[PDB]
Curated annotation (Swiss-Prot), chain B:
This is 42.8 kDa protein in whiE locus. Residues 12-103 form the ABM domain. Disulfide bonds: none annotated. It comes from Streptomyces coelicolor (strain ATCC BAA-471 / A3(2) / M145). It holds the Pfam family SchA_CurD. Gene3D superfamilies: 3.30.70.100. Belongs to the SchA/CurD family.
Length: 361, 362
């Protein structure tokens, strides 16, 4: 079962809902008219439509079409996007961007020629997201304690939204946070960030962050989160097992420069190949990706080290296909990639240090 | 100062967020493949896109382009909309529809050739919506008491949505309920409906409703509100007037059976043209229109009966442009239009009986 895939090749429809400040509708349109060109020239943009609500003049929609998820995902979290859309900050109060894959189309009163005949991804109401950031050389142990010992927020956001799990990891000065949320991601994260237990930990970390932010200014906050976002590009669920040990691991891949998007595509293909013909202790696998940052979050039955290739997603030809995309000798792993002892040592070095795994209903 | 206008003739982009039941995605796609034609064969329907979320398999998008607002409103509010989408409640847990008028388009890497050069509507993050329904002849006075003395609900829904004003009115056996909401109308109405105070009054209404409602069935209720819906097709804000008296009135226009769409577009042009060369005691006017039911909700500085033409939106030639459109005979209004004595007596006859006007802390 693959429930999330950003590699199916489907065309992408993005719904960006904007909330304009009371009375600044003329300034918003003026500011869009100045930045439209830059947005349209983004590699992968096909079409756009700026619309105002017939029910509320503060409600605006920017719907866009992209060739595939990859061009959009590369620009949405880009610093070029942030600089392109910064003169809307005077006139825009909030934004909500939903992203979808096109399955069916009707044009000319008739299904469109080229309409996909793809099948729906089956699944439950869960959204997965990852955050990654760096802390100052010399602050690693302090940051690890802070995040391992925070007061968990109330998972209850609403009838619609609930936090289901938050898993934190560390490798060197890099922290990765992954969450499972029922319902809307933005609503959940905003409820979580307003809780005293979490806002305290955030105020204690700011002094350690390699990039400095002011949770005070929504603009320094949005830029950190745009720069920290690690979208889930693949989720595959596997048949359950009857083992007495269960373990969640985070695997940070030593990627060569420019190879991150390609490692993520290899890892996604491998994970979907395992789902079609299951073999191994993996119970679920999520690929999180931002540039040359590739993380695989794996739930495993039994000892992960009894089955390195299947946990690493480098079963069969993957290990060979990954040698070209990975710098294993930068983390000290020499040896032919398919060999059993090489994959066992790669699992040990790329496994992130678990900090806290908090499960909520 | 016109904040809502459904008659600017712009085309409509509709986003319909669907939340599918967990695991029922294949059945949902198959349910849609067996209803897609009907949607295409709607007049005014131009294009459509069915999309599944990259972040959640149970989140889906139906986005469509419509010729203008009129054909869309005619359809979403219709009974055959509800019947066309009937066999999907088995795989759909919830929907949320948002309607926008398109203002700028980019096709190619180019600003679209036929893109609107229209300027934006200016306003203050308020949604306005009305509902109309009728009670069985003999239940009018019993209904008025209930609707006037019910217990108001928490105007607070969440930190982004709040109920601002609820105003109820009766005329004959017709009730009109208008609301002003900050933020999201669907969330606001669902919060209010779930409140104890208003469920109690709603249960004690159903023995009087000419129309059958079983809010016990989520469908029978959706039916009722779809049928009762009276959308705000126009809203204008006028400069504030010093004034020690401020009054809110609902004008229920007597329309010639044939058509009242044109009466709404007339009261709308006149409201928008008074919104530009404001000269009278009106501070704001919202036009509500379902079919031949036309209601103007007016905020007046001072005595409404001292400037009845401007309160009726029949200043200048409107009253004569409306003569053909109105049945002032059936209400007891004989006279020359464009004339005070008749306009004054029309205001007195079409003005609905105010039952309650609950202004919220917001």
């Amino acid at each position: 079962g693959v429930s999330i895939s950003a590699f199916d090749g489907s065309r992408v429809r993005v719904v960006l809902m904007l909330d304009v400040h009371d009375g600044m509708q003329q300034e918003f349109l003026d500011a869009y008219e100045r930045i439209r060109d830059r947005v349209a020239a983004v590699p992968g943009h096909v079409s756009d439509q700026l619309c105002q609500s017939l029910e509320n003049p503060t409600q605006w929609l920017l719907t866009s079409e992209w060739e595939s998820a990859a061009p959009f995902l590369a620009w949405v979290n880009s610093d070029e996007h942030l600089d392109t859309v910064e003169p809307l900050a005077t006139c825009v109060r909030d934004t909500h961007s939903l992203r979808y894959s096109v399955l069916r189309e009707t044009d000319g009163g008739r299904p469109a020629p080229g309409e996909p005949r793809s099948a729906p991804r089956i699944g439950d109401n869960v959204v997965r997201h990852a955050l990654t950031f760096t802390v100052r050389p010399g602050t690693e142990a302090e940051t690890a304690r802070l995040l391992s010992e925070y007061v968990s927020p109330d998972a209850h956001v609403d009838g619609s939204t609930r936090l289901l799990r938050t898993s934190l990891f560390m490798s060197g000065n890099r922290i990765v946070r992954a969450v499972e949320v029922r319902g809307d991601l933005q609503t959940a994260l905003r409820h979580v960030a307003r809780q005293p237990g979490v806002r305290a930990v955030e105020e204690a970390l700011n002094p350690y962050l390699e990039q400095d932010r002011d949770l005070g200014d929504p603009q320094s906050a949005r830029r950190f989160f745009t720069r920290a976002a690690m979208p889930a590009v693949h989720h595959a669920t596997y048949p359950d097992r009857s083992g007495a040990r269960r373990e969640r691991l985070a695997l940070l891949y030593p990627v060569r420069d420019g190879a991150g998007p390609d490692l993520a595509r290899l890892l996604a293909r491998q994970d979907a190949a395992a789902a079609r013909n299951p073999d191994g202790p993996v119970l679920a696998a999520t690929v999180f990706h931002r540039d040359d940052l590739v993380v695989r979050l794996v739930d495993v039955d039994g000892d992960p080290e009894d089955a390195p290739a299947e946990v690493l997603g480098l079963h069969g030809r993957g290990a060979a296909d990954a040698e070209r995309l990975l710098d294993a000798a930068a983390v000290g792993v020499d040896g032919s990639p398919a060999e059993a002892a090489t994959l066992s040592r790669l699992l040990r070095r790329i496994r992130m240090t678990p900090l806290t795994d908090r499960r909520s209903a």
